[PDB]
Amino acid sequence: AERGYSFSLTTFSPSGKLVQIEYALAAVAGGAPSVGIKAANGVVLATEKKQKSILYDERSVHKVEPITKHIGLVYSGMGPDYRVLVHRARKLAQQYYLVYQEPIPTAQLVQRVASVMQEYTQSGGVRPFGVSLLICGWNEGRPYLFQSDPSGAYFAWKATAMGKNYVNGKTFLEKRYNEDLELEDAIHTAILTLKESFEGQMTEDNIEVGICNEAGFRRLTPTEVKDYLAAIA
Amino acid sequence: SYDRAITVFSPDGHLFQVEYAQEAVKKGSTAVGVRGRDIVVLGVEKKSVAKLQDERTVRKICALDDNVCMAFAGLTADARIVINRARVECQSHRLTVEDPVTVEYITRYIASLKQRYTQSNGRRPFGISALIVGFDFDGTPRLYQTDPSGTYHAWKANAIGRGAKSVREFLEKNYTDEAIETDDLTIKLVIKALLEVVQSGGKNIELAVMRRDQSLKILNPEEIEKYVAEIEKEKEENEKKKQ
Amino acid sequence: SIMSYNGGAVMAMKGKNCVAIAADRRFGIQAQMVTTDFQKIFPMGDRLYIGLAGLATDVQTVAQRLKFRLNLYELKEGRQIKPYTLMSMVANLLYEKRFGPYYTEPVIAGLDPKTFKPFICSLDLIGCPMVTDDFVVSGTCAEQMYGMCESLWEPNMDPDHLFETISQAMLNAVDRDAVSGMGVIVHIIEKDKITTRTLKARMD
Amino acid sequence: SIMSYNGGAVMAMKGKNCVAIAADRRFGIQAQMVTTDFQKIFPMGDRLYIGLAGLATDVQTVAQRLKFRLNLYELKEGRQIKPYTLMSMVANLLYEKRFGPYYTEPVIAGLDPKTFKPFICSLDLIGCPMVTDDFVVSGTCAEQMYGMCESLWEPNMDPDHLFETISQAMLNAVDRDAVSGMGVIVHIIEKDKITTRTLKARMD
Amino acid sequence: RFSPYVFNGGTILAIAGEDFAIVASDTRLSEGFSIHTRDSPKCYKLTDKTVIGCSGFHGDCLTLTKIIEARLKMYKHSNNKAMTTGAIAAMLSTILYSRRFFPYYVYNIIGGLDEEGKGAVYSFDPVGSYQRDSFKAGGSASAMLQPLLDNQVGFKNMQNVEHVPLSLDRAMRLVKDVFISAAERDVYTGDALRICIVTKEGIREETVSLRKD
Amino acid sequence: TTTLAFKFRHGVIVAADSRATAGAYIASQTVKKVIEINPYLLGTMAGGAADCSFWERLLARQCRIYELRNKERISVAAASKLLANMVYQYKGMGLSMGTMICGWDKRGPGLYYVDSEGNRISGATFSVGSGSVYAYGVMDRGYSYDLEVEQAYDLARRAIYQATYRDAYSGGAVNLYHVREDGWIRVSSDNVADLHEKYSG
Amino acid sequence: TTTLAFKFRHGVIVAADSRATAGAYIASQTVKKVIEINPYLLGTMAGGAADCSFWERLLARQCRIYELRNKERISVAAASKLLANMVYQYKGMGLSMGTMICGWDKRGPGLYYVDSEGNRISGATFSVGSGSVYAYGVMDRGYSYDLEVEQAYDLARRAIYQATYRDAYSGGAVNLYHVREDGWIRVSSDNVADLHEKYSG
Amino acid sequence: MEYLIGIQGPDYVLVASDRVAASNIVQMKDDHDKMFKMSEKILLLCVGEAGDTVQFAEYIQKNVQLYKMRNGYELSPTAAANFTRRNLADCLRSRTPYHVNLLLAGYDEHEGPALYYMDYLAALAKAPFAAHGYGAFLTLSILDRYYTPTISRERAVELLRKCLEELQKRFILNLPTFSVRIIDKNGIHDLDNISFPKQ
Amino acid sequence: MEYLIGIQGPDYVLVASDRVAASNIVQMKDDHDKMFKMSEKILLLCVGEAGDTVQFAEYIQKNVQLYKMRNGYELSPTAAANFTRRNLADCLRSRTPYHVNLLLAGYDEHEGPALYYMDYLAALAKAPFAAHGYGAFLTLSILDRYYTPTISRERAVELLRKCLEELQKRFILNLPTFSVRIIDKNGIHDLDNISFPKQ
């Protein structure tokens, strides 16, 4: 037999801090780094997909996930929590589509998923998610890049980074990148800003990249990543 | 749901949560009320005059029905809850019974509600006390007082909240048959009692009166200033020519 | 028939860069007329109108709940609603009552708020959408309206020919039905303006 | 039930050399009483009575047509009618309407005009005869009458005990029925005389 | 479709005397045009002071009986006293009305002694309407039994007769008589008559015989 | 339908609409609902179209044969009684028919209401049809035996008009006849669309 | 059933028969159709016996609890409203029940009619039951607010009597109660058989 | 819906009926007459179905008149009553039954005043007083309460007034005016219509 | 069967109802009131089913009063009308639907006089004048014939009299007296009951 704890596991400290959310962010700023860049004609998501053994099959589990035909996801933090959030996001998108017969605006999906994440900072007997999400999309002509943190808050980004060394990556993007870039250029500076932390020979299997132009969202093949990771092409 | 015992007994036989709620009532703005022959008056103290705040939206005196009015002391939000539930009950009584409502009845309802919140799982006692005032059919003017515990009584005159013992003592020493023999005299008694604890003003005092088969009437600061002028005049024509 | 209890007629027509929507004005109970100024066309935003024919109560109720969801939509999202989107919204709203349906057959007419592309559709009482390029009708005199529309409608009509066409269609269809009429109202909507007229009609 | 429309009660009892026949006096339509002096017992000659309970119209009609045929019989033949003969006559008359029957259940009580031998019978609405040596009942309160008769009736009763018996039976049966009553009439007939009495009864 | 009711016949009678109470019934259980059993009394002993008669649909009779038993026990456990007759009457009323929209097809007559030792009858309808009587009949042959008792016990429609109170003996013979007469006309009444007499001494059971046709 | 007829000092006024429906569908708006039985006898017409037409036509035939046989004109009472008797033999068979027999008689102005149900009553004013109630309203509020001719015309015409306004199954055109001692006269036949302009502004 | 109640200067007169039928069969003639709710509150009883008895008994319970809770006696209006509200929740389920709530209130003599249908109306006089029309006749022909006590008794008793005379489902014995300011009093209980002798000769 | 009433005195019969001919929700006639002169001393008050009333009543009437012409003397009220009852009863189980309730008032040179009551099922019953229609349910009891076999025609008219006033009070139907006639040794006499100045 | 009527003037609303509470064939009350005060300037005229009328009407009433107590100001006639219409429409497809036809009269400090009409199906429609019941079928046309948007309250009362008199003439139901009230800037005013001295 089982029921559940009906009381919040996330409360205010005397200073006024929702401590569990901050600890969740501590979990976030500890996972593999992820960069996202909006580029006028598209969006790029990139992450360190560095396994831990030659025994691992990197072509089975992915960090860059599609929500629909036009929206994509990467993350920083805990894998399982991310997986849960992906399933939920996909479901939300399908609900929106069933109701309106129109692909869900990226901002809307972001808001809804953010509400879902917000629930786990107040609902009973649960901890917040140890995950920050980068959500890319192509709606109404314009490209979109969003971030959502464990508190359920969300921000719109031109470009950003999360995970380990997210500060150095943020300054890097702030300097060595700007608007009017093409998708190719954005991918380039994305793998470049990922290289600013990737301790090791960054192969085509060490990182994962997904793109989202006005032709839909998709994950880049290891071959295309190889072409890009030749410091050119 | 939240099935947790909040209000429980202490080894000395106390209900700490209820006592704490009473202490929350003690921090509230003073609220006094007196019962007269053909009028009944309720007045509330320290209204936290910021002069940038709309006075109307923060009144501590609320009407429950055409028959009954009520003032409070303590947590204002809780008071909003209790007041609304009381109004709803006042209407439901008319729905199930053709007759309106007696002051005693709605008082008993409020009290029962508070007590229910002192003995229910997952909840927490209302941090308010209430002075309920009315003129039920038969003409008899009545004033009651409630408590977070759920206890309720009838009074000739009473006070709650910030400085309640002082005004209670004052009213004890000043409640006569000579005083409150006329409407203006009863109102003046309320104003005096309030002035005996308020930070000396008149712009800090909100007073309202119910009379006979009429509706509830709130006093404008002009009329309050007039009654306070007459009170400050009677304090210099009967207390200056003898001291 | 339940639909025939109140009666009424609603029509929508397509134009060049304009669109039209018309409806009779009679509110009656079976055979008696109660009101001659009953609104059956409601604006769901600038340059987007809906027209409900059928059981008066469900007309008003569907209109109101639709305005509810619409307002919430245009609040959650920072935009006006697209015609297709509104259509799907109505479809969903109606189909939620699949086994206890509102007795009304809505007709949507408007212009794409981003573009200007004209749009007309109609729906079931259970919310099955149907988009057309010429006309859509719904009401107790649907056959008459079909009769007029199939013979009067031309493709690229200017805002003046469209008015005359939809007006003649409505008037002459309605005049062969006993429970539709007591006046006709026409909204002709274009990118720049909206023109609302009440026609000279029979009142019997 | 059609029989219960007017209500009523008819009873006949046998005696030593006498016979008895009684009936209530209420003419009512369903629940309302119209008359308190309604005749339900008719003389079909000296020392021979018939009593009809059921639908008032068919009571009167059957009585009248029976008197028709009876008169014709006593004219064609130079004699008064025998009880058995009258019974067969009624049976025939009723059965002629086998598939559209009169709604009345007749009860015949009399003395043999030649002898004096007492006689009581009853019939269906379709005319099935039933002769008894004690009592016969017909009406809306037949079960009550059976109840009284089965407990009060004795064999060789004198013209005074018979009266008391049939009177108590009728009164107490009728007083447990809502559509029977408003007075009881009793005919006690013997060779020498006929005694007609109306009892003191409840009128509610 | 399906009918949850079937009429099983049976007649029932109760008479209240000054110091006694008689509750009698036939013993025939039938269905349609057939006899289920000839040994099925409709009398049920509830307490030393109270006997109940239940006629009609046998399923509801059995059920209601067992319910009444159980609730008697409950009351006994709750108040440390036995249920008084009138109390059982009131309880039965509530129980019967509890199925106001799916009634027990049962005619109920309660016979016993009150708290002053005197006799009392309580007649019921299938949905709880009851009243106190000196004598009442119920069941199939009810309309055959009632009129005689109205005459003989109530002295109704009798001029210049004496109002002598009913003795136990005369009451007994009256019961036997009305049942014997009912067996003649009612097809649901027959086989045997069980009589239950209730006095300060307790409850006697007698068994007269009725015809078997 | 919405026919009405009332008798005053100067004869018998008869009025009707002209709408004919087959369900909610308006099949016609040009129906002559006032049948001209004789040059002195009129018959209004409401209910089943075929029923009314057939039976009143047959009534006209019968009245003509009566006129030839008795060398005199049939009375209003006799005509109404004739129609009533003919119709009564079909009672319960489903004839929907409610008519008014109007004329001038040896007893002066005559007006009878005859039902397919079996009614037959003489009276001052009468209104028959789906919109009869609405007509009854204004007609009763404006009737008098001392009405002048044009006033009576106005009253009848207006009553039928208001009737057409409220009753969904009444419309088309108000037709108006006047029955005088030397016979009846076809007073007017105004369309409702025009009467709207006349009465409103 | 056949009950009647009317209020005059000296309180509220209540009267009833006592017959109870199960079809045409008279099941009882000794039924108390005037339920004594409170020593100041009476409730007449017509229609379904079990329904009336149960619901008015429950009403009595509720009024008692009210009396204990509010430390005062329930008003006539409140009692009638209570019963009406209880009954309304079962509307359409087939409760046959028509009762009168009578008493003396802070507003003086009070009389209400309460239906199982959902009616609840105050009034001067009322008659409920199968024989209500017959009672209404004589009661209306003999009523006055300025009736003296014995006169009111005569009027009520006679009305119920005539009702029992015409109505086949009304009879037994006329019961009569009088509601005064200090409570009600059981006036009479005369059998109809005796009242016949009294009224006829 | 229609209302008939008859009150028999020692030497007279007083009869009254409503004057309303109504269909649907409207009164179509305010001077309708429900009485039929059949003899110089016999009135037939017929009420009920649409055409059945007038058809049946007129049939009976013309047959009575035919009797008078054929024989030189009129039918007695009793013979008349049984004639109508025979006709009505004969059509009861036929293809064309007449749904009519009726009263028959009459005066005989031998038997005096007489009042008869007839169900639509053709059940004939003589009575000192009777009434037809829903209004009867409100008036009969009154007639029970105040009628005496020796009542004078003035007192009878007053009683009738009590009844009609009761109709004005309790009955939901309009019924503003009433036809009132009396029958004695001098035949049928029309009385002033009992009416109530409503509007 | 019940009758309601409303006539809106330029600055007032005149409302009237019948005073009959009837069951079966008898009038059980001659002073029944069909109006419900909901605000100081709002009247609710409800009519129809047995308990549904009073239940629904009182529910709405107490809810409006609750609004007043909770907020310190009263609902506008329009807000009220849409509130009642919402409640009635919500119960339409439920287990407990209220079979009630209604009129809502009101005066707003901003929008002036207002009259509303409601089907039992909860179809709300504003009108210069309206009526409920069978009587409406006889009165509405009259209202069409004589009503003008600028009609004075005296003329409005006279028009109402024409309607009620027409009811006395054609309607088969009794309906002797009528409750009449008016609503303006000074709230609800009770007028003399239009009655017709029948009996």
Ligand SMILES: *[C@](O)([C@H](C)CO)[C@H](CC(C)C)NC(=O)[C@H](Cc1ccccc1)NC(=O)[C@H](CC(C)C)NC(=O)[C@H](CCc1ccccc1)NC(=O)CN1CCOCC1
């Ligand atoms: C009243 O109306 C006067 C007498 C007019 O009838 C009295 C008033 C009251 C308080 C006594 N009412 C009755 O007498 C009432 C008639 C009635 C019955 C049913 C519905 C509505 C009115 N009689 C009863 O209620 C009656 C009580 C007797 C005194 C025993 N009980 C019954 O008739 C039993 C059934 C009631 C019921 C059963 C199921 C659901 C709802 C209600 N009747 C039977 O059990 C036997 N029987 C079966 C076939 O014939 C009819 C009844």
Ligand SMILES: CC(C)C[C@H](NC(=O)[C@H](CCc1ccccc1)NC(=O)CN1CCOCC1)C(=O)N[C@@H](Cc1ccccc1)C(=O)N[C@@H](CC(C)C)[C@@H](O)[C@H](C)CO
């Ligand atoms: C084709 C039109 C012009 C005539 C119309 N006829 C018809 O409606 C015929 C009648 C067929 C029939 C069969 C068996 C028995 C009787 C009739 N029906 C059809 O033609 C076919 N339909 C099938 C489905 O839709 C409805 C009818 C009619 O009579 N309408 C009546 C109303 C009506 C009465 C009875 C039965 C059916 C309909 C009418 O207009 N009556 C007016 C007066 C007369 C003289 C025209 C008035 O009553 C006013 C206008 C209100 O309707």
